[PDB]
């Protein structure tokens, strides 16, 4: 039922299976049965063992061949059988070290160097794992975002990553030099969506109490092996000219440096790299990587409390209405342009797995809170008669669609919270402003996401204390003759260095005519008035008469 004779018949049937496979209607399931039975009947060391390896190599290829005959992406039962078969093939390869390769020590019957090229055969083994790498990505792209299946199939990623570690420990310098460009990318695939907690566990668990130990100091060093390789690979890529991979890798390194290292290194590397010219010419996947890293840079800037840097780092994204399409969540009518469906079938098969998502609704909150903190003091200073720098289409426009609602009282929605926070910030009660931002983001499951939650809350608390004091001084400088600085310290719940720092910068960089005494803790100003404000508004209006009068002359001539 095989054929009950040695060696040469099995080699003929492997050729028969390869020849049959390239014919269109062929019984691929029966070929898989026959390949399994050809493994079962083998008995001789070197030859039968190497025939099992040469067959097992083709079992993975046949399983990849079989599934597109009737759906989908690879069936999960077939994929788990590939996962088992790849591990057993790796265990046989780890046991073997080049038995059956020949390498002119034994030739009857050996040879992976003939029919042909032993390094090519050794390199093809990674390209078999790559078909499991493909199908796993396809499953986690097309399974539902909120299914229990999605949670379950996330468990298999550790099993895939463990196989990549088995493969990286089976090279072999001559395979390493050429596969390194793809292996660097595979290392990036298992790194470029990593979260805080693992970096926090290794860097913050007391070293006196922690691991002391032989297994632990394989595995811990194992985890930061990826960032050890990353630092080597940057230098190794100065040999290579695959600049789509170089541009993609640098964007991932900026993501890695921002999230798991320190926010200076991400800014240093981005300001070194200059990839603007590259992203135009480096295709949609690299452009999607640029968007992934750009979101992460703004989130990390927000996690260090820098509102300008956070606002500027999301500017490209938040001046674009097309962010929903970038994550594959586009509809075929939602302005008037979004066609045709036939092209969109390619695009939805490239963008994007749910476990690789970023939340846009959170991104809008980060951008709007960052902008709100900057622009509410800016409008308050200007329209209390320092009016000289208005920017047409900034935070005022995003506020405007919720500002003009005469029916808007309690919020349920994310945008309604921002309008409520803006209403609180315009009034200026800082404890009320904290309460609306903090409570409703615990209630909405949005504080929970980062172990830096209290650090970010503390930074936002201090920015609200500083800019509430700033709006308080801008509004009440309309009546204040003089101000004591003890009352400002206690009432805004701040230290005297912070209060002296806030007031001095406000006087110094809007260039206010206010006499500050730091030794006697007292501000004297006398800037009043109701009529003076109308006079400044009229003088601005008259200045825009002279500016237009002289613009008409420069059109004329």
């Amino acid at each position: 039922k095989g054929t009950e004779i040695t060696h040469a018949v099995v080699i003929k049937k492997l050729n028969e299976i390869l020849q049959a496979r390239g014919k269109k209607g062929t019984d691929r399931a029966a070929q898989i049965e026959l390949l399994q039975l050809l493994v079962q009947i083998a008995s001789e060391n070197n030859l039968g063992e190497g025939v099992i390896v040469k067959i097992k190599f083709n079992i993975i290829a046949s399983l990849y061949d079989y599934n597109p005959n009737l759906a989908t992406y690879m069936k999960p039962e077939m994929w788990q059988k590939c996962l088992d078969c790849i591990n057993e093939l790796m265990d046989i390869l780890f046991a073997n070290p080049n038995i059956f390769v020949g390498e002119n020590i034994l030739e009857e019957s050996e040879n992976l160097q003939n029919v042909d090229q032993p390094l090519r055969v050794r390199g093809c083994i990674l390209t078999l794992v790559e078909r499991m790498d493909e199908e796993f990505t396809k499953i986690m792209q097309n399974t539902d975002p909120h299914s229990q299946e999605y949670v379950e199939h996330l468990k298999d990623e550790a099993q895939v990553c463990a196989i990549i570690e088995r493969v990286q420990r089976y090279l072999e310098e001559k395979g390493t030099t050429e596969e390194i460009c793809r292996v660097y990318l595979r290392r990036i695939l298992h790194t470029y969506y990593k979260f805080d907690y693992k970096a926090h566990q290794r860097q913050l668990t007391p070293p006196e109490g922690s691991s002391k130990s032989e297994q632990d100091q394989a595995e811990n060093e194992g985890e930061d092996s990826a960032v050890l390789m990353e630092r080597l690979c940057k230098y190794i890529y100065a040999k290579d000219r695959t600049d789509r991979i170089r541009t993609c890798a640098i964007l991932c390194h900026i993501y890695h440096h921002y999230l798991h290292s320190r926010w200076y290194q991400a800014r240093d590397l981005m300001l070194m790299s200059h990839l603007q010219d590259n992203i135009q010419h480096a295709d949609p996947p690299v452009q999607i990587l640029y968007n992934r890293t750009m979101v992460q840079l703004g989130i990390c800037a927000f996690r260090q409390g820098l509102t300008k840097d956070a606002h500027n780092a999301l500017l490209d994204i938040q001046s674009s209405g097309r962010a929903k399409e970038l994550l594959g969540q586009g509809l075929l009518l939602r302005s008037l342009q979004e066609r045709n469906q036939e092209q969109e079938k390619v695009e939805r098969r490239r963008q994007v797995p749910f476990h690789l998502h970023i939340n846009l609704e959170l991104l809008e909150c980060v951008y709007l809170v960052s902008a709100m903190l900057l622009e509410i003091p800016y409008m308050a200073a200007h329209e209390s008669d320092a009016r000289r720098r208005m920017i047409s289409k900034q935070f005022h426009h995003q506020l405007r669609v919720g500002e003009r609602q005469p029916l808007l009282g309690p919020p349920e929605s994310m945008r309604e919270h921002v309008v409520a926070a803006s209403k609180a910030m315009k009034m200026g009660d800082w404890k009320t402003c904290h309460s609306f931002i903090i409570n409703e983001k615990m209630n909405g499951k949005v504080w929970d996401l980062f172990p830096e939650a209290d650090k970010v809350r503390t930074m936002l608390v201090r920015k609200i204390q500083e800019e509430s004091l700033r709006t308080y001084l801008f509004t009440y400088s309309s009546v204040y003759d003089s101000i004591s600085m003890e009352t400002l310290s206690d009432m805004f719940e701040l230290d005297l260095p912070t209060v002296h720092s806030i007031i001095s910068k406000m006087i110094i960089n809007e260039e206010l005519m206010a006499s500050l005494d730091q030794p006697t803790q007292t501000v004297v100003m006398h800037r009043t008035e109701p009529t003076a404000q109308q006079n400044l508004a009229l003088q601005l209006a008259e200045k825009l008469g002279s500016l237009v009068e002289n613009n008409e002359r420069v059109f004329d001539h």
């Binding site: 539902d144 003009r404 005469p406 803006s422």
Partner: protein
Amino acid sequence: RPENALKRANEFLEVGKKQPALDVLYDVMKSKKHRTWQKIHEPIMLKYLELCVDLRKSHLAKEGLYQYKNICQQVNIKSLEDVVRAYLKLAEEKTEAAKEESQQMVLDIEDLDNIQTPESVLLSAVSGEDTQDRTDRLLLTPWVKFLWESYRQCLDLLRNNSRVERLYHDIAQQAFKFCLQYTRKAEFRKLCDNLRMHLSQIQRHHNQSTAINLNNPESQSMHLETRLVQLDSAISMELWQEAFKAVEDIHGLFSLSKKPPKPQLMANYYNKVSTVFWKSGNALFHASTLHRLYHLSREMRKNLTQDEMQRMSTRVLLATLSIPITPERTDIARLLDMDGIIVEKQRRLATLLGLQAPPTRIGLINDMVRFNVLQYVVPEVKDL
């Protein structure tokens, strides 16, 4: 002929999961089998088939579309009975959902976090939430039926009493369960599209008028559903936008048909819910609604007699203390982008409410003092 009843007997006894798939194909075929007009045998024969079809749950829309035209042969009892089925069609789907909704949580308690914690942390970090398939797939199927019956009311037309009597109260009574469980966003759309259907029905006049009070159970349902959703949780703007358009129609209809005392009393009760919501969201709308509430309730006391002296005393003291409390405008960006557009909507919404322009702080105190309800105010509050 009797051969329909023999098949309907056989299919029901034979069963096993392959055969109901064949029954679904056969029921779609049976749905036009015999061009007759309902008298004795056909209602008896059809209703037993319809009961099997509801149990099979065959295709959702098609059975409905056939029922949409089968009921038109004057079969009044069969329409009412199908509305009684309509609660059962959805109710045991909420119990079936509840069986899974409870079952999954028992397993969640029985399993062990400490061997699922990496995935739990990743599921939180990716924000996929506390989600499970079995309740979701069960939740979608009654919602299709729920919409199909509201669409059916807009196509039943004319008399539609079985739907007017039961189906609106049952839709509201079911809607509360759906809103509490999850589907508030679907409920928000359902209220908006039901209002479009209601206004469209009023605009038909196809053997229908205000003299049989057809508008009143539909408006009563829409008021009860919007009022509960507004209290429990929803976005502020849209519930008010649809509710104000419904109030404009009802104010028209009440003025045309003459002012009806019990629906105006219900409108007074709805206006008390409105005053509390307006104290949270807009003091000017509270002042006009509360003044309207005290005016309308004063007229109801004159028209209908109300001896609830203690409750009237607490309600007058609540009115006098609550009414003048209107702060000033702190919305600086709104002032720059022109407050007058917000004022335009506030004036038109106040005219729609029926009390002209929003009342100003001193005048609102002054005319409330001139009203003889000041005499009735409680001593401690009066001397306050």
